Amino acid sequence: TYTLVWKVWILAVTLYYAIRIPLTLVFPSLFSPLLPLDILASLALIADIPLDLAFESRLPDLLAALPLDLLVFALHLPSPLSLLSLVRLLKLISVQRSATRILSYRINPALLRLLSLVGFILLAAHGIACGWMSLQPPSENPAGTRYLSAFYWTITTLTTIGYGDITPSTPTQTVYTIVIELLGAAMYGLVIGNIASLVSKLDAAKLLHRERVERVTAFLSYKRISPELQRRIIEYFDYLWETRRGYEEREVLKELPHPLRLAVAMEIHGDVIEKVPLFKGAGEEFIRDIILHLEPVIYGPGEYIIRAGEMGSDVYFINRGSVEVLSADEKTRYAILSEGQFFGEMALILRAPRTATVRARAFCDLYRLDKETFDRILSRYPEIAAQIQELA
Amino acid sequence: TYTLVWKVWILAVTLYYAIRIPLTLVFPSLFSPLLPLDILASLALIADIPLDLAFESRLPDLLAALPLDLLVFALHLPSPLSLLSLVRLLKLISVQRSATRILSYRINPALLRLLSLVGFILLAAHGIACGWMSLQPPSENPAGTRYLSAFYWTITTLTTIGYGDITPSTPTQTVYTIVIELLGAAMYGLVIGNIASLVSKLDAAKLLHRERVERVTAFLSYKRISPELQRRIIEYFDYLWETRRGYEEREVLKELPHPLRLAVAMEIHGDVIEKVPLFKGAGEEFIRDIILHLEPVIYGPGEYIIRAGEMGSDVYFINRGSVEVLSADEKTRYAILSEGQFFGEMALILRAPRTATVRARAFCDLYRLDKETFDRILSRYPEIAAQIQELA
Amino acid sequence: TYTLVWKVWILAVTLYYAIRIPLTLVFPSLFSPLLPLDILASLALIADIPLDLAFESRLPDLLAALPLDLLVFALHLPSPLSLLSLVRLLKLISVQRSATRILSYRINPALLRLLSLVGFILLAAHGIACGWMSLQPPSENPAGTRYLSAFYWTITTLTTIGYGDITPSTPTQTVYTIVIELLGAAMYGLVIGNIASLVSKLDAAKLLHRERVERVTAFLSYKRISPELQRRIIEYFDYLWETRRGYEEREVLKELPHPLRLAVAMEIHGDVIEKVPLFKGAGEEFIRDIILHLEPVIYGPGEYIIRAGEMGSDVYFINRGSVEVLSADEKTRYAILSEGQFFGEMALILRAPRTATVRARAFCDLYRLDKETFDRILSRYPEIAAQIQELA
Amino acid sequence: TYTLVWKVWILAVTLYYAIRIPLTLVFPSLFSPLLPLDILASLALIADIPLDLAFESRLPDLLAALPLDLLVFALHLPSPLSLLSLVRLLKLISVQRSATRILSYRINPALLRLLSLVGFILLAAHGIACGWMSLQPPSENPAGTRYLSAFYWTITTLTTIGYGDITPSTPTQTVYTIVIELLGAAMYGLVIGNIASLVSKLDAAKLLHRERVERVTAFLSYKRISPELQRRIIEYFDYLWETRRGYEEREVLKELPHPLRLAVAMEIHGDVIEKVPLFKGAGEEFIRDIILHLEPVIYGPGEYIIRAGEMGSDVYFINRGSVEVLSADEKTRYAILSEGQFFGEMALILRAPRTATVRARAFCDLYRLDKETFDRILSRYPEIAAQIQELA
Numbered sequence A, B, C, D: 001t002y003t004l005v006w007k008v009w010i011l012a013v014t015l016y017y018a019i020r021i022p023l024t025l026v027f028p029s030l031f032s033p034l035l036p037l038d039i040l041a042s043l044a045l046i047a048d049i050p051l052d053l054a055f056e057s058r059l060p061d062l063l064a065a066l067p068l069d070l071l072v073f074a075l076h077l078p079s080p081l082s083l084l085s086l087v088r089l090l091k092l093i094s095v096q097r098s099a100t101r102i103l104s105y106r107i108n109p110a111l112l113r114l115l116s117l118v119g120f121i122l123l124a125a126h127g128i129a130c131g132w133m134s135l136q137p138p139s140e141n142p143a144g145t146r147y148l149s150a151f152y153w154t155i156t157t158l159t160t161i162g163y164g165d166i167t168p169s170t171p172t173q174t175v176y177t178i179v180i181e182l183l184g185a186a187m188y189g190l191v192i193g194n195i196a197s198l199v200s201k202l203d204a205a206k207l208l209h210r211e212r213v214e215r216v217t218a219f220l221s222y223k224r225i226s227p228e229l230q231r232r233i234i235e236y237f238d239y240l241w242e243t244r245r246g247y248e249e250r251e252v253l254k255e256l257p258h259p260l261r262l263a264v265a266m267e268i269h270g271d272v273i274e275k276v277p278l279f280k281g282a283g284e285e286f287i288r289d290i291i292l293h294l295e296p297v298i299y300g301p302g303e304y305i306i307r308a309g310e311m312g313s314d315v316y317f318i319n320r321g322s323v324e325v326l327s328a329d330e331k332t333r334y335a336i337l338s339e340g341q342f343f344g345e346m347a348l349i350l351r352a353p354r355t356a357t358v359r360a361r362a363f364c365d366l367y368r369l370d371k372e373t374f375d376r377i378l379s380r381y382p383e384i385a386a387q388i389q390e391l392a
């Protein structure tokens, strides 16, 4: 974690060069008072790439490492050959490359891109204000006022607002302004594109659920389905949103490898499976096969799970909801079942008519094992199969 | 439904503070005439969070609850310590959080976001106009004219229009204007991004259908398909758009749980299945299996459904279209079949050559059951199987 | 096709009212010279809704049908009660609703939306210019110059350019300008959103193919695949783009119903299947099953289709490419096969070692039938099965 | 590769006409000094379409081929009939059509579209500046200053900045400015839409992986999974990003035809399969079937692959990771397995209890063959089946 301090220090040093270099290009006086800071930052930049190689597309580091400054401000070079101090502003490409990889997971990449673009735009605005100040007529005005005027002009130009109170007066000013207008239009377009991209991907799951509900409702409208069934479907979809944001269990768990899927299935269904009379005293591999073949099914309130008198072929394990066991005529409540329990266990060993009616109080979200998968998997574990056959 | 009145009242109170607080910051005279309303709103805000806890990320409520105003306007504090009345404008974060959850289902979330952004932008424009009025030279002008001028300046700045008739004159005005230009560019970019996001998701189904038609047409172009077949396909796809917006039945009904899917299938196919000679007097579970295994198929106008003399293995139930039964030589019309009827019933009990030719008048949209699924499911209901075998 | 003329005439009439009504509101002189056109358009609008009901959300038609004009310009009503002539500009909602449904299939809906927005923006600019002219000081200037000035001001405002040479002078002008600035920002944001939506969906297939190629190349990079195989894959993907725009046959034909799929398969494979020694003299249903079970497979240049000495279980039908039959040692060319021919026919009746080597000159794009599907489908047609068994 | 030189030369010639034609329209003096270049470019354009037909929607070529210039500048035609020299600027449509097909694969098409739009915008700005210069009052000013002023005005207008220092003065200037404002708004909207489209599709894979991780984490949050399992899943997903950018092997290899899939599978698994005691001396087709039926599975660090005492039905081939073979009580390390080796080979010939415990050091990324697929495919190769049965 010691490299984060070095990265932050390098960011501070490059922001220092970004602010001072154009400012001292405009004002050559500011070179002796900030000399020790310049020397210290030059050493830091020289030593950075040794520390970049240790504990790990490269020209920017070499070009910003060597001190092309400290000589143009010492020998007092002319304007054409004084702009070679800005090669040290190529460190930003590397600072941004480091920042986009030491924060690619905690922060949304679109937001990181937008923030980096905003910072680059502010630095470029400072540089453009310095360039505008340089190519101005010499007048006796305070330096702060002349900076606040150049910065006001460049912010007015970059935002495409264009008040017009500060305008070009010389042909060189006009050419510079044309260039700055082009870059300002490009940068504002980039900002708008970044914002539009950031906003498009915000509510993806809500929009997907809304489109699914609209498509289902339109299809049921075509098939002339009664309003009661549509109301039940809309209440289901709403409950799905308020519980799992409209996500089916089967599609989420196909995004995982076999060991992780097995671990999740065990952590969900272990005690509930283990505490079954039929399967107690059986091995762990048989339990794993069952724990891997349970199919999620959500039953709405008042829906029929098992009806009295039907043949029946499935067993159900309650995971979240509640259930009422009732008579054939639905006059007497045998029992109320909650989490951790099960019903329909007397169907994996006999194919007899069912013994009661099962109804749902609220949304159930229970798992189900069919007798076909159970018989399929029972072929490879004959000991249990014998116990089941004797039980029958 | 009593909480909606309270939410609307809280919205009105916070819009009141949003309008009055900056206005009375600019004009300290407006504090006695609106004193009872201020007291009443202060009580409402104090009592709101007791009513927020009952019948249900929290600091904004506490910071807006306490009256940091009513003292800066009573003791006549100076400008640095007079801006502590605006902490009560943090209630907007909670009003927006309530609005985005008491209307997340009726309104498109993108539209709600755009409307909330527009309201926030108007409130911010009022506040920025007040701030611009505050840092103006003292002159004897009517208050309404000075507000209409500050509001004109801030609307001109926020929209990036920039007429330039009203411009900064002092360094403080220049700094304030630079800040306002930056926020105006950000807010306009946000508005444009919201509008682009809202417009991109408008005609999703039409675009999907258009891309499917284009891909199919291009693929048939590669395979050099005759124009008649392409014309038939385009007429089919068009009928699919004018009926179900280009949606396949099988993919729509996989978006539903087993009980809801069973209910929809029963409500679609119940009387049509029930009134079959072969299956009358059979149980409800057998009917449910058939009602669950019917496969949708749309036949175009003039298409062959059953041809005379073929072996044949399927039965068809008419759902929407019309049919003409015709001779082997297609000279005599045996019958015309409409909704609620069926044909090909003498194929689930014998594998004999067919007895007539079936043609479609218009698009049919009929269901079909194959003899393989029927035989598969007949294994678990032997009583019916015996009746079928004796019938054969 | 007579309704298109009526729709175009209604569009012309409503564009006439859109241009004349605000213009004659500004200039009350222009009411007698254009009186017959106004009467004729009023009759046309009165009679339109009788013709809207015949040969087929309704208030706009009734509100634009009755002549609320022809009285405000006849009795010379004052300004508050003179703006009731613009209710007849609600016909645009219906003209646009008709246009978006009589051209929803020929034109891209995004382009139609953009064009409708542009037309509405131009009409609104004309109306806003008229409103700006109305609330101007009375001066003796030519009407054309005053219109060209109001239109210049409104175009400068709506585009967010804001030259500033024409600016408000009165409080009413300032309020009107604030409103127009808000609507101009909204309309420009709408235009930008429409353009971004139109441009995002332009090159969908090319982008999908590019992402597939990038993903495949990156995955092969991880697995350290030799450059020759990567080059072969890239040449394949390129050929897929230059032939079918990167579309797999199997996914395109699952977008069609069973009769259309059968018709396409017959039109592709009919003569090629029919002219097979093994299957000649067989029925049409057997041919249909084969024509429905042929699987597309593209072989690259120089690839092995059948190798000498392998067991072999498949038959291949050439559809587009060319093939070279060669010896076990690949020294002698037995034959060259083109479209309409086949090879490997002596594998659906015996499971013997193969008799030659098959190589591809260029990309083949040939179909393949396995012996498993052939045996599966041969169970239900025993006569052919007997002929095959005797042939073996 | 000789056509690229001709295309570049044609691009240079059309950029020459784009710059000179409006410039010599404004300044009729510049027609004799550049006469030989004009003649040479006219010959080049005349000869281009012969070379367009050889070594290969056409009107632009014919309209730009004939010299409608060289006569309006020779006979000194008036202004209405002097604007017929610009028909030769229709060559740009063909230059762009050539550029969008000789670089559709190396360059992102969105970037190519943006660059072409930028170039067209710069050329249009030059033309608009020339048009603005033409309709200016005659004054004695240097030509360069008048161009730099017209270009400054058109760049200020096109970027929607609108300083306002240069404004219309005549009605013709006002109409021209209104037109230019409309085209500038359209072009800036097009640029913003292009940038937004380019930025939306940048980090597609990272966003897909982020959404998968968010959905999985939310679903596990609903099911109340312990933090240890969630931490293991997040470490897995992270390793998947740092290795294959979040791509599953099975979905990537379904994007390839059977020969390419077979070649990739052979190049991945060949030596590892070949060096197996059970399968040595067997044929190549049997090896191909195995090499086609190996299923990828990634095991995390510390995960159980084979547990001592279980029945066991699978064999594993190590591809990338490392493995530790351990005792039933996990006290003694039998061996450490690296790339190119395998374990569990004594399960495809007997269904005996396993003989050791297999654990993963780091992420493994190993392949697995089940005994069901092996038995399925062993039916069609009886010789090996006999060798396996005798081995058992």
Ligand SMILES: Nc1ncnc2c1ncn2[C@@H]1O[C@@H]2COP(=O)(O)O[C@H]2[C@H]1O
Binding pocket: A306, A312, A325, A334, A335, A342, A343, A344, A345, A346, A347, A353, A354, A355, A356, A357, A358
């Ligand atoms: N007295 C009871 N208490 C709790 N559950 C019961 C009772 N009687 C029946 N059931 C359950 O109701 C089911 C209905 O018939 P099954 O064969 O599915 O198996 C039955 C049991 O799971």
Ligand SMILES: Nc1ncnc2c1ncn2[C@@H]1O[C@@H]2COP(=O)(O)O[C@H]2[C@H]1O
Binding pocket: B306, B312, B325, B334, B335, B342, B343, B344, B345, B346, B347, B353, B354, B355, B356, B357, B358
């Ligand atoms: N006279 C008739 N009226 C109505 N439908 C008929 C008549 N004759 C035959 N059909 C139907 O036409 C079908 C053609 O042969 P099937 O064996 O499919 O079963 C036949 C019946 O469904």
Ligand SMILES: Nc1ncnc2c1ncn2[C@@H]1O[C@@H]2COP(=O)(O)O[C@H]2[C@H]1O
Binding pocket: C306, C312, C325, C334, C335, C342, C343, C344, C345, C346, C347, C353, C354, C355, C356, C357, C358
């Ligand atoms: N002389 C030949 N001319 C054309 N095709 C041949 C010739 N000999 C063999 N073939 C084809 O090459 C195939 C190789 O072995 P098959 O059993 O697949 O069936 C063979 C035929 O399809």
Ligand SMILES: Nc1ncnc2c1ncn2[C@@H]1O[C@@H]2COP(=O)(O)O[C@H]2[C@H]1O
Binding pocket: D306, D312, D325, D334, D335, D342, D343, D344, D345, D346, D347, D353, D354, D355, D356, D357, D358
């Ligand atoms: N001494 C050993 N060295 C390396 N691998 C072993 C050793 N003993 C067992 N194994 C492997 O561990 C596996 C555990 O039981 P299997 O039947 O899967 O087959 C076994 C071998 O693959």
